[PDB]
Amino acid sequence: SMTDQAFVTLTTNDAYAKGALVLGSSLKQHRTTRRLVVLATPQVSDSMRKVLETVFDEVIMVDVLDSGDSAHLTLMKRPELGVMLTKLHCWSLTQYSKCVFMDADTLVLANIDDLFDREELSAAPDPGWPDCFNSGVFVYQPSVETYNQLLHLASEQGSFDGGDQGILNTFFSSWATTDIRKHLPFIYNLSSILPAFKVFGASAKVVHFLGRVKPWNYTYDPKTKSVKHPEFLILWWNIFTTNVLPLLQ
């Protein structure tokens, strides 16, 4: 296998854990040759970590509240940024030479191992402000150096919405104007879920359920096989019910 490269996702709770299980299961379904990693916190229940270990190759515990954690000092300056400081540990994974970070609210529809042809920092434009890249799917190179610099920036600048996108766009500020090969096609992070979707949505590789209501916040009804287009939402729930639930033997 490519033991040197991984898909890396994050969950700080049992709800986003359901996302990660669907993401990981979807990467396996499309036969990734790379490792699957999930960053998890002590807020994820032991019982959920046991399920995550059935999908992920590594469940890596990160606890920013631990005084021995690399991000703990930054957290005392910015106590509102625990989730994003947890996310930033993706750069601490120096056992890998290259990774694709994916949000736990994403879902893979095709093999996307060709993302490992890209260099740090390759990412898709954010709908709404497309000179910024969306931080939900990105190719990067773990580095303690880069990690510490992102921590400093988080300390200095903070994050109005608690997300990492501003910080990552501030650090990787040449993305908009430099090297078109670092622009991932939008189909690798399809996040604006009429006429553009009717022509190109069929070729989506990754769906991103960006925004307030996540697929797992819906109530699924087996009797109608529907939540109470929801095309993508139905596919999420199809993977969950078909591929995830039976991992619980």
103 binds Mn ion (CB under 5 A): yes
Please give the Cα distance from 26 to 244 (Å, whole number). 10
Strands, DSSP E only, in the chain?
A: 2-11, 34-40, 58-61, 98-102, 106-108, 122-125, 133-140, 206-208, 220-221, 226-227
In the list Mn ion, ligand UDP, a second copy, none, the entry touching 211 (Cβ below 5 to 8 angstroms by class) is ligand UDP
What are the distances in angstroms from CA 40 to CA 43, 62, 181?
8, 6, 31
* String marking each residue 141-160 x if it binds a second copy according to CB under 8 A: -------------------x
Q: Would the annotation count 14 as a binding residue? A: no
* Both structure tokens of 27: 């990467």
Q: Would the annotation count 77 as a binding residue? A: no
In the list ligand UDP, a second copy, Mn ion, none, the entry touching 131 (Cβ below 5 to 8 angstroms by class) is a second copy
Breaks in the chain (C to N over 2.5 Å), named by the residue before each, are: 193, 228
12 vs 169 by CB, closer to a second copy: 169
- Helix (H) and strand (E) counts in the chain: 8, 10
117 binds a second copy (CB under 8 A): no
* Both structure tokens of 96: 């890998």
Q: Give the binding-site size for a second copy (rule: CB under 8 A).
A: 28
In the list ligand UDP, Mn ion, a second copy, none, the entry touching 79 (Cβ below 5 to 8 angstroms by class) is none
Q: How far is the CB of 199 from ligand UDP (least distance, A)?
A: 16
196 vs 248 by CB, closer to a second copy: 196
In the list a second copy, Mn ion, ligand UDP, none, the entry touching 126 (Cβ below 5 to 8 angstroms by class) is a second copy
Dihedral sign, Cα of residue 94, residue 96, residue 98, residue 103: negative
Closest CA to 163 of 70, 58, 77, 81: 81
Q: 120 and 179 in contact (C-beta within 8 Å)?
A: no
Q: How far is the CB of 205 from a second copy (least distance, A)?
A: 13
105 binds Mn ion (CB under 5 A): yes
Contacts with 69 (C-beta within 8 Å, 6 or more apart), sequence order: 62, 63
Q: How far is the CB of 66 from a second copy (least distance, A)?
A: 30
Q: Would the annotation count 16 as a binding residue? A: yes
In the list a second copy, ligand UDP, Mn ion, none, the entry touching 205 (Cβ below 5 to 8 angstroms by class) is none
199 binds a second copy (CB under 8 A): yes
Contacts with 192 (C-beta within 8 Å, 6 or more apart), sequence order: 127
The residues of the shown chain that bind a second copy, judged by CB under 8 A, are 124-132, 160-161, 166, 176-180, 183, 185-187, 192, 195-200
The residues of the shown chain that bind Mn ion, judged by CB under 5 A, are 103, 105, 136, 210
